[PDB]
Swiss-Prot record, chain B:
Annotated effect of mutating residue 608 to G: In strain: Nonneuroinvasive mutant HF10
Biological processes annotated in GO: bidirectional double-stranded viral DNA replication; DNA replication
Subcellular location, principal: host cell
InterPro entries: HSV_HEPA
Protein name: DNA helicase/primase complex-associated protein
Consequence recorded when altering residue 243 to M: In strain: Nonneuroinvasive mutant HF10
Length: 89, 746
């Protein structure tokens, strides 16, 4: 895959450039399986109104991985921004 | 001693539908004429008709409908506060009702014509129109218009929509909303409706938080638009003096609403509020609150429209998008209104003839034809194609090919057969609906507005009378027979087509072009003349003289399925592809890729053994698939681009319980449901109705491992057709998507 598609495949399938660069503080969602289960549902309550289907410790990891993988569409804040609660994510 | 005036009727609406005393099987209907004299000055007029039960059952097509049912529906529609949205119970009932009242208006009173000069009379002793006559003096005033924008947040409870959609599965979601308002009219009392009617004289804007409550923002007044008129009437049905309030539309004539986000519930609610406001004071009769549109039926409809069967009496035209040519579609809607008396597209196929008088005309047309076509009609089975064509796996070239079409052959043939059965009609005056179809056919080449009418009036008429299909397809079969007979004389060779449109080849040397034009033109002349001669011999006479269209000259032509044909003229590099489904925005890019791959693969006419060409063709086809899937990645996040338009007939994905929450977005869904298959979590692929969610959308990554598979499926169909049609057969072009380039998405 040569051209702009190489750059596309890189960002689309690799951790964002500024995600593994030493930063002064952390920024993300850290909680036990029980709490993060509730927070994932709460994030979906603000995510369902615009397209995300409802998902009525493996389910939690699958849902978190799917949220993390979802890519940024232009300048719009990404899908995981509902859980992480920042627009710089 | 009858009064006489000079006016043009701008609209015809239904005020009252009553059952007089000592009556059992005939009901009277009062019609409101919005007449305007010269220089635009408008005086309101009224007429009465008398429709019998037999006529109702004729325009309905069945005897299930009765006079009592119609009068009960009209009485229910008398009050919009108690129950609006009356047509939603039996839409066919109101459709037939408008059809018969217009027919009786034409019969008893006389010939009527919107936006046209008309000498009108009246009887003061009773006070209604008595006779309408076509006039021949006056440059009638231009049909002025007013631009209307209306948006309302009718807080419909989602669960009711879900339940009503569960009762009838493939219910277009606008019908679900509309049924929700019908079952709970109080929901139409509370809505943040905003209205802005701009005219050429004065603007008018209102804003509401609750509809019944006084406005939270005013502009102009109701009186600037409307001139409320109280008119006394003495119908034959009502001996006592009956007074009617009407909303005379001063300044404007009809409404122009954008069809982009048109909400039939919005206009229904606004007009219900106006109805309540105007007819709040008693001492006068109340009109009919009836509206029809594609949103009023479970399965929906192709063409957006908003009928005004009663209150307020002003036609409202929805012109969907088309911003570049907005004036063109506004003029087309105005012409469609004026010609077909405003019944179209609400009344349906009954504009021409009652749905049940057709079984007689078709039989009366099977008799006046020639003896051969008489049987040819009777032996028509769906898709017979009794003509020498090409095997669907085949291709031709380099030979001089040409495509031909008769513009509007089904409509013209239907008109001629309707005239053949015209003598068989009960009423000679009941043939005026047979004058609108000739007006449509005559004006079809001149103006495209008649076109879209004829491409829907004809197929729907063929559904109203199933027996008309076997007649039309027999006449067209006869036309194709003489096309084939005349083809041999002019070196033309029938190779494929679908009747009115047919493509063929020429037995001329495939290098000379100076004489090519001559033969291509002589073939057109001879085929047109011979088909016209057969039609004349079959007694069928066309109003607009028949014309054959040279829709392109090409050198190579390849066909794979019955409808899939690709033509290419190497000299000018002009091509044409048909049979590839355009079921979304990605299918257009696929079609372009196919039309470039085929242009490159038939450019391989370099002298080679046929075996070599098959491989150097398959390689290029695989490379084209590669370049398509590579570009697919750069648009993987455009869900609207990876969207498919599912029809209300096709099997559809099940509606997510959150798509029932679109608010003023569920109303846009009339015909098509645009679905994108996304892949949440893993393994499971779920469908998202794209146009039922607010924008910008947030979704899990689009399952391109499903849409690209279907796009590729049809690409391999075309490529297997061309590979097995130009060179030796035996090769089913398959692209290993699951292995070569599956990783990109899944």
């Amino acid at each position: 895959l040569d051209g702009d598609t190489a750059k596309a495949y890189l960002r689309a399938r690799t951790y964002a450039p500024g995600a593994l660069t030493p930063a002064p503080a952390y920024c993300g969602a850290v909680d036990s399986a029980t709490k993060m289960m509730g927070r994932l549902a709460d994030a979906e309550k603000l995510l369902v109104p615009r397209g995300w289907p409802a998902f009525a410790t493996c389910g939690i990891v699958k849902r978190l991985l799917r949220l993390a993988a979802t890519e940024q569409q232009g300048p719009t804040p990404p899908a995981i921004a509902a859980l992480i609660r920042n627009a710089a994510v | 001693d009858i009064v006489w005036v000079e006016e043009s009727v701008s609209a015809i609406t239904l005020y009252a539908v009553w059952l007089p005393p000592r009556a059992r099987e005939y009901f009277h209907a009062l019609v409101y004429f919005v007449c305007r004299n010269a220089a635009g000055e408008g005086r309101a007029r009224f007429a009465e008709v008398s429709v019998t039960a037999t006529e109702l059952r004729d325009f309905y097509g069945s005897a299930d409908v009765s006079v009592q049912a119609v009068v009960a529906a009209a009485r229910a529609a008398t009050t919009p506060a108690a129950s609006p949205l009356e047509p939603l119970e039996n839409p066919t009932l109101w459709r037939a009702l408008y059809a018969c009242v217009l027919a009786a208006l034409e019969r008893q009173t006389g010939p009527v014509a919107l936006f046209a000069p008309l000498r009108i009379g009246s009887d003061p002793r009773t006070g209604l129109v008595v006779k309408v006559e076509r006039a021949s003096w006056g440059p009638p005033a231009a049909p002025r218009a007013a631009l209307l924008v209306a948006e309302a947040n009718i807080d419909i409870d989602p669960m009711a929509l879900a339940a009503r959609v569960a009762e009838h599965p493939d219910a277009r979601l606008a019908w679900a909303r509309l049924a929700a308002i019908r079952d709970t009219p109080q929901c139409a009392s509370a809505a943040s409706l905003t209205v802005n009617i701009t005219t050429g004289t004065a603007l008018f804007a209102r804003e509401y938080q609750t509809l019944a409550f006084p406005p939270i923002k005013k502009e102009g007044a109701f009186g600037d638009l409307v001139e409320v008129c109280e008119v006394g009437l003495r119908p034959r049905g009502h001996p006592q003096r009956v007074t009617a309030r009407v909303l005379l539309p001063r300044d404007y004539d009809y409404f122009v609403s954008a069809g982009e986000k048109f909400s039939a519930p919005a206009l229904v609610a606004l007009f219900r509020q106006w109805h309540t406001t105007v007819h709040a004071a008693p001492g006068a009769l109340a009109p009919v609150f009836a509206f029809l549109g594609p949103e009023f039926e479970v399965r929906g409809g192709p063409v957006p429209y908003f009928a005004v069967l009663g209150f307020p009496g002003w036609p409202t035209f929805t012109v969907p998008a088309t911003a570049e040519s907005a004036r063109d579609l506004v003029r087309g809607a105005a012409a469609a209104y004026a010609a077909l008396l405003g019944a179209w597209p609400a009344v349906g196929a009954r504009v021409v003839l009652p749905p049940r008088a057709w079984p007689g005309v078709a039989s009366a047309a099977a008799g006046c034809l020639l003896p051969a076509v008489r049987e040819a009609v009777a032996r028509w089975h769906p898709a017979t194609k009794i003509i020498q064509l090409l095997d669907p796996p085949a291709a031709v070239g380099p030979v001089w090919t040409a495509r031909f079409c008769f513009p509007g052959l089904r409509a013209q043939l239907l008109a001629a057969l309707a005239d053949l059965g015209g003598s068989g009609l009960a009423d000679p005056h009941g043939r005026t609906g047979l004058a609108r179809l000739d007006a449509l056919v005559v004006a079809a080449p001149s103006e495209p507005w008649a076109g879209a009418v004829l491409e829907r009036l004809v197929p729907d008429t063929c559904n109203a009378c199933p027996a008309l299909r076997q007649l039309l397809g027999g006449v067209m079969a006869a036309v194709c027979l003489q096309i084939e007979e005349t083809a041999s004389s002019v070196k033309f060779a029938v190779c494929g087509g679908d009747g009115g449109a047919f493509w063929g080849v020429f037995n001329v040397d495939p290098q000379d072009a100076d004489a090519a034009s001559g033969v291509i033109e002589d073939a057109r002349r001879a085929i047109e003349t011979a088909v016209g001669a057969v039609l004349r011999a079959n007694a069928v006479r066309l109003r607009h003289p028949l014309c054959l269209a040279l829709e392109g000259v090409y050198t190579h032509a390849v066909a794979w399925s019955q409808a899939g044909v690709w033509f290419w003229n190497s000299r000018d590099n002009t091509d044409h592809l048909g049979g590839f489904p355009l079921r979304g925005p990605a299918y257009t890019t696929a079609a372009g890729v196919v039309r470039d791959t085929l242009r490159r693969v038939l450019g391989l006419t370099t002298a080679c053994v046929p075996e070599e060409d098959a491989l150097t063709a398959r390689g290029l086809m695989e490379d084209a698939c590669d370049r398509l899937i590579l570009d697919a990645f750069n648009k993987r996040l455009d869900a609207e681009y990876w969207s498919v338009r599912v029809s209300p007939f096709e099997a559809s994905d099940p509606l997510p319980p959150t798509a029932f929450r679109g608010g003023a977005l569920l109303d846009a869904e009339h015909y098509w449901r645009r679905v994108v298959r996304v892949c949440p979590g893993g393994g499971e692929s779920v469908g998202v109705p794209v146009d039922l969610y607010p924008r910008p959308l947030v979704l899990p990554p689009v399952d391109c491992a499903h849409h690209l598979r279907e796009i590729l499926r049809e690409i391999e169909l075309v490529f297997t057709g061309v590979l097995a049609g130009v060179w030796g057969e035996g090769g089913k072009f398959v692209y290993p998507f699951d292995d070569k380039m599956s990783f990109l998405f899944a």
